[PDB]
Amino acid sequence: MVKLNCRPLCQAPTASRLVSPPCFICRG
Amino acid sequence: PAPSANPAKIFIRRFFSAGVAKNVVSYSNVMAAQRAME
Amino acid sequence: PAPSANPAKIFIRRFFSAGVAKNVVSYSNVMAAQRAME
Amino acid sequence: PQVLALEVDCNIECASLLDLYGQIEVSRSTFTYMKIADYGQLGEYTCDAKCDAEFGEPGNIRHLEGKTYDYRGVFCFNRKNLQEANYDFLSFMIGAAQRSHRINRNQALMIGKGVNEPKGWLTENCFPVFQTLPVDVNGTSTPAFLAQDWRRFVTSFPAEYGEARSVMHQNVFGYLAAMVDANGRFLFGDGDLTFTPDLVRERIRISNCLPDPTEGNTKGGTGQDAFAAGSFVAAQAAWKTAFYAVEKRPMFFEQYEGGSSAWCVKYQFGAEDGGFVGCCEHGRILQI
Amino acid sequence: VDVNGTSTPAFLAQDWRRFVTSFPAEYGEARSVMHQNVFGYLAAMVDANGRF
Amino acid sequence: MNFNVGVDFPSFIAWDGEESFPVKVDGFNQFGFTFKTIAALTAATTFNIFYHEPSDADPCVPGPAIRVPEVPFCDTVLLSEDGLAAVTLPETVTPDSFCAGTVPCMNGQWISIAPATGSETNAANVQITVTMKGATR
Amino acid sequence: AAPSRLVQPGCFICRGVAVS
Hints:
It is classed as virus. This is part of a larger assembly, with 1 copy of chain A, 2 copies of chain B, 2 copies of chain D, 1 copy of chain F and 1 copy of chain G. By secondary structure, chain A is mostly loops.
């Protein structure tokens, strides 16, 4: 009864944008 | 007692300067004293 | 007592290095002391 | 013919990104440590009136290890001018060695590339990297970096990871303190000719040999001075657990009898050290 | 909120100060819970000119 | 009671007798080869050792094959006439006996083995594998 | 050293409401 325990070798970067609240714009 | 005012201020005006930490003996003299030991 | 803090730390910073077991006399001096016995 | 004692040198170090990383000391040149991959789930919300249970799924305990890399060099003289000199070559040349090691260790620990040098956290590229939006001007879509980003970046750190400092080149701080609103007022330090708060309280340690996105302080950016999107600006990490720097033996100097051919007294120096990135989840990178 | 042409939804600081102080007073003390990112979405807000 | 020795010193095929394979050694710190033949050899066989570099197109696929230099310790007197590391399986190696060896200094991220010219028809009767040591990350 | 410029950030305000 064999059990495997596998794992990656080459990692991948993690890019993500950093959007911020937009310009205050009036509701009128 | 101590007056803190010596007449030795003739130098620090221009002829010497404060707050630079000058060495006490010339390197020529250091080498002469070194070589007199051999 | 035991101030442990002597002004002899000038030399270990760079002029010397910790944990090397440097010999106490130059090899030239040993050979000079050797031949001086004959 | 009136030689002075003046020794103007005019050379600079960096800051030191060393007291931040977690310090560990090893005697021999091969250490090993454990790691908890994941606790895993154990037990579900089973129903009632069921004389049974479920084994769940066990966790995982990885076992890691890392080496320590060495640092050596050589320098020599001619033994003829060293006896007549108007200076002391050794005490200067020795002083020239840690200055090379202290600056090489710090940079390699930052940007080291794999083999025979500790992998720096820059080239590792497992720190999550956050890139900022570009802006519009006269239709053009130049990339920029506003104060609105900096507050967003520093605040987005997970609170449960702990308190984390920030590292950045001073040209970025000069760029931040010199920002202007619409009217013309300054954003920080309104009306005192200088904005300089105590960095230790804003937990922002400063340095000088980071990638420095504002090239020579000349790329503020409106036209052809754009930040050249894809450049490092600042980093933030709980350093006492995100990166470790190991030390084995400080530098040593040993005369090399043999190879010295009665003309060339040849000294030898070396040192051993190393580093490795721990859990690279505590720590993020801001980018353009 | 209205933007150039479309009607993209948003969330302004004025919309939050209006919500918290809109709780029936005769209910006792009432706090609020939010994700860290949401709190990190009110600090970095800009007025018309440049100000936080 | 044998353990899952697979993790904690895994291994991969480096030369199956017909084609080579690049093996990544970045995740680990120490490695070595385990030569093993399947049939009696005819003459001394020589293999070249190659180290790769991360490709510019993709950072975890190996690029071109550069040859690793040779490092003498003190006792070395042959120097292999080229300054380029190479292994040489000697004659009279019966096919129930393995042979161990490794380079004293790695470089890059990958290592590959290939039969040197002249001994390309005998290398088809040998097998070369790589086993690493503890994982850095 | 050659005279280097000192370009500083201009009036930077918006990222999503570009004027007509």
